[PDB]
Amino acid sequence: PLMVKVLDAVRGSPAINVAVHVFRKAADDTWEPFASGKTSESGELHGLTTEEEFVEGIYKVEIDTKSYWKALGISPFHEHAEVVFTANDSGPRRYTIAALLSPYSYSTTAVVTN
Amino acid sequence: PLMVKVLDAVRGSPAINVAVHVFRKAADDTWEPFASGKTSESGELHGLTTEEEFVEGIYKVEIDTKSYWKALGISPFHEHAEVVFTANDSGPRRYTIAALLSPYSYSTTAVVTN
Amino acid sequence: PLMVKVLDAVRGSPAINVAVHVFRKAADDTWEPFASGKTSESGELHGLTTEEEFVEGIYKVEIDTKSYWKALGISPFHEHAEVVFTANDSGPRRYTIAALLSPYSYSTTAVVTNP
Amino acid sequence: PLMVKVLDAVRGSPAINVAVHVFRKAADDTWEPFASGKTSESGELHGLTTEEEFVEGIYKVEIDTKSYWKALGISPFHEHAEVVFTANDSGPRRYTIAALLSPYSYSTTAVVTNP
Ligand SMILES: O=C(O)c1ccc2nc(-c3cc(Cl)cc(Cl)c3)oc2c1
Ligand SMILES: O=C(O)c1ccc2nc(-c3cc(Cl)cc(Cl)c3)oc2c1
C-alpha cells in the first residue's frame, strides 16, 4: 500500500541506498516510528507496510538526502526531505511517494491509485 | 531502450491517454517522425522503439499536455511539453523520460540506466 | 536574510496568503518557534528575522500548503511542505526558500547569497 | 510584458548568463525569431519585448540549458528547455517564465498577471 521512489536529478539515475524513515503521528502529536529501509538499485523501497497495518492517519516520510549527497562527495543544502500527508480510506488504495533530488532542491509528488 | 512516463500533479495519478510523439533530428535540422503512442493506465508508454532503431542522435519527445488538461475540463498554459535530448552510446542504455504535469507548470527528468 | 516565495502551479500566479512558520532547533533538540508570517499578493514573505537574530542553527521552514489549498476549497494531499537546513554556519548568508505548489505535489529550491 | 527567470538547483543560485531565444509562430506555421537575451547576475532577463510588439500569438521560449551547463564544464542531458504557450489572446497580460535547472532535469512554471 506504500512505496517510496527516489530519483537523482544530477546524475539522471535512481537514488540508490538512500535511507528512508516512515513515522505515524500519535495521539499526543509526536511522531512514532512506523517503517524504514534503504532504496534499492531502482531507487525504490517496497515492503514498508501491509494493508492491515497502514490505517488512516498522518504519516511522515523522511528521506536522508544529506547522507546521499555526502556519499557522492557533494555538499547539499537540506538536512533531509520530509513528506507529510494523510492516508484516507475514501481515496485510492495504493500510495507511491516519489521524490526528485538535487543538491539545493527537491520535488515530490504522490501517485495514488487503485 | 526508450520509455515515457507522465504523472498528474493535480489529481495525484498517472496521466492516462496522453498523446506522445517522438521525433529524430534529421541532417537538415528538421524533425522527422520517429515513434508515437498514448500513455497507458499507468501513465507509461512502452514499445516506442527497438535497440536497432534507436541510434545516437538528438530526439524530441512532445507530450500533448493541452489536450490532456482540456479533456479534464481544465484550461492549461502550455501548448505541449517538449523534451529534447541527445542519445549517447557511451552512457547507459535505457532511457526513461518522466514528466510531472500541472496546468501552468511541468517538470521533467531523465532516468538513464543499464 | 530570510525570504520565502511561493507560487501556484494550478493558477499560474503567486500563492497569496500562505502561512509560514519557521522553527530553530534548540540545544535540547526540540523545534523552537522562531518566526512566522504570511505571503503577500506577490507570493513573498519578507521581514521574518534580522541578521542579529538569525544566528547559526538548523532551521525548519514550514509552508502551510494544506491550509492554503483548503482556503481555496480544494482537498490537497500534503499536510505542509517542510524545508530543513543548516544556516549561517560559514557566517551570515541570505536565504530565499522558494516553493511551487500543486494539490498533490510541490517543489522547493534555495537561493543562497553572500552579501 | 515578458520576463524570464532561471535558477540553478545544483549551486543554489540564480542561473547567470543563460541564453534565451524567443520565437513566435508565423502565419505559415514557421517559428519566427522574436527576441533574445541573456540572464543577468540575478538570473533574470528583462527587456525582451514591448506591449506593442508582444501581440497575440503562440510563443516559444527556448532556454539554452545545454550551453549553460557546458560553459560550467558539465555534460548535461537536455539540449534546451522549450516553453510554448499562447499569449495575449484575451488581451495583454504580463508573463514570467521561470525555470529551475539541474543537469538531468528541469522544471518550469508561468506567472501570468493582468495589469
Ligand atoms: O512510480 C513510479 O514508478 C515512478 C516512475 C517515474 C517517476 N518519475 C517521477 C517524478 C518525475 C519528476 Cl519530473 C518529478 C517528480 Cl517529483 C517525480 O516520479 C516517478 C514515479
Ligand atoms: O518571479 C520571480 O522573481 C521568482 C522568484 C523565485 C522563484 N522561484 C521559482 C521556482 C521555484 C521552483 Cl521550486 C520551481 C520553479 Cl520552476 C520556479 O520561480 C521563481 C520566480
C-alpha cell, D114? 493582468
CA-to-CA distance for B100 and B106, rounded, in angstroms? 6
Domain assignments of chain A as residue spans, ordered by start: 1-114
Q: Is C50 in the pocket of ligand 2 (CB under 6 A)?
A: no
Match 516512515 to its residue by C-alpha cell.
A22
**Cα D107 to middle of ligand 2, angstroms:** 10
A81 close to A101: Cβ distance less than 8 angstroms: yes
A108 close to A97: Cβ distance less than 8 angstroms: yes
CA-to-CA distance for A101 and A14, rounded, in angstroms? 10
C2 close to C43: Cβ distance less than 8 angstroms: no
Burial of C73 (0-12, 13-18, 19+ CB in 10 A): exposed
CA-to-CA distance for B34 and A16, rounded, in angstroms? 32
CA-to-CA distance for D36 and D19, rounded, in angstroms? 8
Beta bridge partners of C8: C13, C101
To test ligand 1's pocket by mutation, which of B46, B95, B109 has the most ligand atoms within 8 angstroms of CB?
A: B109
- Binding positions of D for L-thyroxine are 5, 44, 107
Q: Is D100 in the pocket of ligand 2 (CB under 6 A)?
A: yes
**Cα D35 to middle of ligand 1, angstroms:** 34
Q: Is A98 in the pocket of ligand 1 (CB under 6 A)?
A: yes
Through-space distance between the first and last CA atoms of chain C, rounded to whole angstroms: 9
Through-space distance between the first and last CA atoms of chain B, rounded to whole angstroms: 10
Match 527516489 to its residue by C-alpha cell.
A6
CA-to-CA distance for C64 and C24, rounded, in angstroms? 17
Q: Is C100 in the pocket of ligand 2 (CB under 6 A)?
A: yes
Closest CA to C84 of C60, C68, C108, C63: C60
Phi, psi of A106 (to 5 degrees): -145, 155
CA-to-CA distance for B87 and B94, rounded, in angstroms? 10
Q: Which CATH architecture has domain B1-114?
A: Sandwich (2.60)
D109 close to C100: Cβ distance less than 8 angstroms: yes
Are C100 and D107 inside 8 Å of each other by CB? yes
CA dihedral A100, A105, A111, B2 (to 10 degrees): -30
Q: What is the dihedral sign for C-alpha A64, A67, A73, A74?
A: positive
C87 close to C57: Cβ distance less than 8 angstroms: yes
Q: Is D105 in the pocket of ligand 2 (CB under 6 A)?
A: no
CA atoms within 13 A on the CB side of B35: 18
Are D13 and C113 inside 8 Å of each other by CB? yes
3-state secondary structure B5-58: EEEECCCCEECCCCEEEEEEECCCCCEEEEEEEECCCCCEECCCCCCCCCCCEE
Fold category of D1-115 in CATH? Immunoglobulin-like (2.60.40)
Q: Which amino acid is at D12?
A: G
CA-to-CA distance for A16 and D28, rounded, in angstroms? 49
> Which residues does chain C have within 8 Å of residue A102's beta carbon, measured at their own beta carbons?
109
Can you give the resolution of this entry in Å? Answer: 1.3
A57 close to A49: Cβ distance less than 8 angstroms: no
CA-to-CA distance for B52 and D97, rounded, in angstroms? 39
**Cα D70 to middle of ligand 1, angstroms:** 26
> Which residues does chain D have within 8 Å of residue C111's beta carbon, measured at their own beta carbons?
7, 12-14
Match 496546468 to its residue by C-alpha cell.
B103
C80 close to C63: Cβ distance less than 8 angstroms: yes
Q: How far is A42 from chain B (nearest CA, A)?
A: 9
Q: Is D102 in the pocket of ligand 2 (CB under 6 A)?
A: no
How many residue contacts between A and B have a Cβ separation below 8 Å?
Answer: 31
- Residue-level length of chain C: 115
Are B9 and A112 inside 8 Å of each other by CB? no
CA-to-CA distance for C88 and C93, rounded, in angstroms? 6
C-alpha cell, A56? 488512516
Are C78 and A58 inside 8 Å of each other by CB? no
> Which residues does chain D have within 8 Å of residue C109's beta carbon, measured at their own beta carbons?
7, 9, 12, 100
D22 close to D34: Cβ distance less than 8 angstroms: yes
C112 close to C97: Cβ distance less than 8 angstroms: no
**Optimal mutation site among A31, A109, A111, interface C, most CBs of chain C within 10 A:** A109
Closest CA to B21 of B41, B45, B43: B45
Are D109 and C13 inside 8 Å of each other by CB? no
What value does the CA radius of gyration of chain C take, rounded to a whole number of Å?
A: 14
C-alpha cell, C66? 494544506
A41 close to A14: Cβ distance less than 8 angstroms: yes
Burial of A83 (0-12, 13-18, 19+ CB in 10 A): buried
Can you say how many angstroms the Cα of residue C60 is from the centroid of all Cα atoms in its chain? 8
